[PDB]
Enzyme design. Structure first.
Site, short mmCIF file in Angstrom:
data_model
loop_
_atom_site.label_atom_id
_atom_site.label_comp_id
_atom_site.label_asym_id
_atom_site.label_seq_id
_atom_site.Cartn_x
_atom_site.Cartn_y
_atom_site.Cartn_z
N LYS E 11 0.82 -1.18 0.00
CA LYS E 11 0.00 0.00 0.00
C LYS E 11 0.88 1.27 0.00
O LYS E 11 2.10 1.22 0.23
CB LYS E 11 -0.94 -0.07 1.21
CG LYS E 11 -1.98 -1.24 1.09
CD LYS E 11 -2.92 -1.23 2.27
CE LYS E 11 -4.06 -2.19 2.11
NZ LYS E 11 -5.05 -1.92 3.24
N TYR E 51 -11.89 -3.53 -4.30
CA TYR E 51 -12.52 -3.67 -2.99
C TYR E 51 -14.05 -3.78 -3.03
O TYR E 51 -14.73 -3.53 -2.00
CB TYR E 51 -12.11 -2.50 -2.13
CG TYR E 51 -10.70 -2.57 -1.63
CD1 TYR E 51 -10.28 -3.60 -0.78
CD2 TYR E 51 -9.80 -1.59 -1.98
CE1 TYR E 51 -8.96 -3.66 -0.28
CE2 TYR E 51 -8.50 -1.63 -1.47
CZ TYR E 51 -8.09 -2.65 -0.63
OH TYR E 51 -6.77 -2.66 -0.12
N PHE E 59 -15.88 1.93 6.21
CA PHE E 59 -14.50 2.30 5.91
C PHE E 59 -14.17 2.37 4.40
O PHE E 59 -13.10 2.94 4.01
CB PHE E 59 -13.55 1.34 6.62
CG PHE E 59 -13.70 -0.12 6.24
CD1 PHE E 59 -13.20 -0.60 5.03
CD2 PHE E 59 -14.30 -1.01 7.12
CE1 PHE E 59 -13.32 -1.94 4.72
CE2 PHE E 59 -14.39 -2.34 6.85
CZ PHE E 59 -13.92 -2.83 5.64
N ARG E 87 -1.23 -14.69 3.99
CA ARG E 87 -1.99 -13.92 4.95
C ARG E 87 -1.41 -14.11 6.35
O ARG E 87 -1.33 -13.13 7.12
CB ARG E 87 -3.46 -14.37 4.95
CG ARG E 87 -4.31 -13.96 3.76
CD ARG E 87 -5.61 -13.28 4.17
NE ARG E 87 -5.99 -12.15 3.33
CZ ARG E 87 -6.93 -11.28 3.69
NH1 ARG E 87 -7.60 -11.47 4.84
NH2 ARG E 87 -7.24 -10.26 2.89
N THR E 93 -5.32 -8.42 9.56
CA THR E 93 -5.57 -7.23 8.78
C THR E 93 -5.48 -5.98 9.72
O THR E 93 -4.93 -4.95 9.35
CB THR E 93 -6.90 -7.37 8.01
OG1 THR E 93 -6.84 -8.54 7.16
CG2 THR E 93 -7.10 -6.17 7.20
N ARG E 104 2.81 -6.89 9.39
CA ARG E 104 2.06 -5.81 10.09
C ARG E 104 2.41 -5.70 11.57
O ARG E 104 2.54 -4.60 12.07
CB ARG E 104 0.58 -5.99 9.92
CG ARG E 104 0.09 -5.82 8.46
CD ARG E 104 -1.38 -5.87 8.44
NE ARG E 104 -1.98 -5.80 7.12
CZ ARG E 104 -2.58 -6.82 6.52
NH1 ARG E 104 -2.67 -8.02 7.15
NH2 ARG E 104 -3.13 -6.62 5.33
N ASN E 114 -2.12 0.08 7.07
CA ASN E 114 -1.73 -1.31 7.40
C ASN E 114 -0.87 -1.97 6.36
O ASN E 114 -0.78 -3.20 6.28
CB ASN E 114 -2.91 -2.20 7.78
CG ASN E 114 -3.79 -2.53 6.64
OD1 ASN E 114 -3.72 -1.90 5.60
ND2 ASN E 114 -4.63 -3.54 6.83
N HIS E 117 -1.71 -5.55 1.38
CA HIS E 117 -2.90 -6.35 1.12
C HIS E 117 -2.47 -7.71 0.59
O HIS E 117 -1.54 -7.78 -0.19
CB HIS E 117 -3.78 -5.65 0.03
CG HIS E 117 -4.80 -6.55 -0.61
ND1 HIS E 117 -6.04 -6.75 -0.05
CD2 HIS E 117 -4.70 -7.40 -1.66
CE1 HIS E 117 -6.69 -7.65 -0.78
NE2 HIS E 117 -5.88 -8.08 -1.74
N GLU E 128 -8.29 -10.84 -8.38
CA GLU E 128 -7.37 -9.70 -8.17
C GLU E 128 -6.25 -9.77 -9.23
O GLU E 128 -5.86 -8.78 -9.76
CB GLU E 128 -6.88 -9.65 -6.70
CG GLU E 128 -8.02 -9.31 -5.73
CD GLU E 128 -7.67 -9.45 -4.29
OE1 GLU E 128 -6.50 -9.79 -3.98
OE2 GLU E 128 -8.64 -9.35 -3.49
#
Lengths: 151, 151, 151, 148, 151, 148
Positions: E11, E51, E59, E87, E93, E104, E114, E117, E128
């Site tokens: 990000k 998204y 959010f 993940r 997350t 993270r 954060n 992704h 994706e």
């Protein structure tokens, strides 16, 4: 039995760019002893006194202003030839000329944002240590690995 | 001459200061192949042999004693110009002269506590390998990345 | 209980993928003492002895071949709860279940290529140490940092 | 200034992409463009056009096409010359510990990385490897701490 | 064979805070194969597409605007159970709940900042990947260490 | 929020100061205050005043006075709780890999670091170990990338 000492300061840019731990680790892992450390925003007058020998240089007012623009980490490190060796570790004052492997060579680009200061001589070091620290802020202790760093 | 070998020993100080893994990583990441490795306290007599060429030098007695004062990690590494390149990686024998980025430059201060040894020539390397290792302790295998390290 | 020992072996994949130094560093930095280390290609005969408790598992034949397919780094490490703690450091035997921060969690993917072994109990550690090492290959020395690792 | 840096197939194969990028990031340079690709033999023949008459030119193109490369553009003061200093000398044997080639490789034919040799070559290489719209403009949050 | 693939995007905060290399190194060292990578400022409509399942969460609007506020590094990685394992490596997350050792957990604090992704399922991943990448941007090559990562 | 973190004498002795600081910096927390000192026995008695009547108290004060410590104040969202999660459990045995204690130490009596257990404890510790003028106010250049 006290070895040579040097004054090292991480400049505001070194703090801002998150390099405080990385810099300290390089001195620790070399075998130098941390004798003193503090974290402060030095006053403009204090900085003028620190850099008094540069007062006529055209960069001096901008140097003082930048050095006051954020906090610094002030340190004293001890060991054999720590003043000269510290400067070699830091790399040339102009990062353009600092070699990869040095602090400035690895982590910065421009002389006016060159992340760290180290004393240039033993006499400079003693002046700087006295300017920045009270005598009682210098801690006397024995490194557990001393006899594996020094014969 | 991708088949050259050198002898590298982590001295007692290197062991004691926790540098074994760091030192091996430097040789692995460079592309050299580990051929042999063991961990031992070298006897006085074994070290006298190893350092017979320095036996009429003033620092010789002290050197033998330091080298017997804890265990060493003995290694053989293979690759193109590994003897000379190994020595560049270690830095100058005297840490005072070793550059930042080198093993001695980064990690030690004084020549009598200089953490590591590497062979100074192919001839010395073969002698040192023979003294410290049995031939059956030399392991032959092919690095999976060999054809990406060598043309 | 500070004299407990465990057997750790870096498997052929750990050597081929250049992880020897990373793995050793993890044990050094934790405070454990390196007691013994050697590098060898273990024979099939030898590996059948090591994995005796898994002899009827369907994966035993393949495990034995894998473990002979390249050299391993065999090690003994010492310290308080080093057997249980060593296994925590390594992660679960399936890498997919091993947490980030562990050796397996950080560095590998599949159970058949799980880079490292550690003894599962004190009793098995003593058996494994005896199998892989001669008593004279177990080195006695005291860590300079011992009194700062242990009360 | 901008420079073109390419991680060669051996750098990708030996798992050095993250290490190499971190070096440029920690120095204070700004990443402007990045893509991962197998460069075509025709794209590589253009990149190496100055060398088309040499007897090693086929083998060079084969090597450089033999796996993917990471192509990047980095921006900063003197980034062309400083990027070369960070890579080390073209022969790894002469590259000092601390440099990318000095730390991570051994032989000149498997020397993991390229950087532009001059601003001239950099502008050539950038135009060849990237579309203008792939050069992303943004300001580093640490800019005022990297530059006066 | 073609193993499973996942989409990972660093990000704009990951890029701004100088974490691109750190992140890529963690996936390389795990043994996953990099398949695709580009660096771009994604359009708000592209980000709304990415998204879309979250379009009714409160959010969502702010998330789209933040994701357009600087460039991202978009990647495709391959390996066994790379979606789920990826993940786990990223951490929860919400960084509040992410464990030390995860990306993270080590490097960020707040869910709106954060850093990264990763796809939440194989079906999400395929969607994706197709959204961010042209089919020809996915590179087929064989990792030199593949047979040391997989049996 | 702010928390008090101290690197204990064993953490200094074992060469872990830089490592530990880097963990807080890289997380995104802001360093507010830092000093290096041998804390006096009276200072430590105050720090541990709740334990003054316990039989282990003299030994504890003696250990904590047996070398210098690094005293720090760090700021950020739920830094008290998260600082404790980063340090790991108070027995290193129970501390997971990735935490400071899990990575770097073994025995509860040599557990390298302290963090405040509560916001109230943090405020007491900060007031005991620092003068108000030693708490430095500045804005991290990356602040808007760490917080929305």
């Amino acid at each position: 039995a006290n070895l040579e000492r040097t004054f090292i300061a991480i400049k505001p840019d070194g703090v801002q760019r998150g390099l405080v731990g990385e810099i300290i680790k390089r001195f620790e892992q070399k075998g130098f002893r941390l004798v003193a450390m503090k974290f402060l925003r030095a006053s403009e007058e204090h900085l003028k006194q620190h850099y008094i020998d540069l007062k006529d240089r055209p960069f001096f007012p901008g140097l003082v202003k930048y050095m006051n623009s954020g906090p610094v980490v002030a340190m004293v490190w001890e060991g054999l030839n720590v003043v000269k060796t510290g400067r070699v570790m830091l790399g040339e004052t102009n990062p353009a000329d600092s070699k990869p492997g040095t602090i400035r060579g690895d982590f910065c680009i421009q002389v006016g944002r060159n992340i760290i200061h180290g004393s240039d001589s033993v006499k400079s070091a003693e002046k700087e240590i006295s300017l920045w620290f009270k005598p009682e802020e210098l801690v006397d202790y024995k490194s557990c690995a001393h006899d594996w760093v020094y014969e």
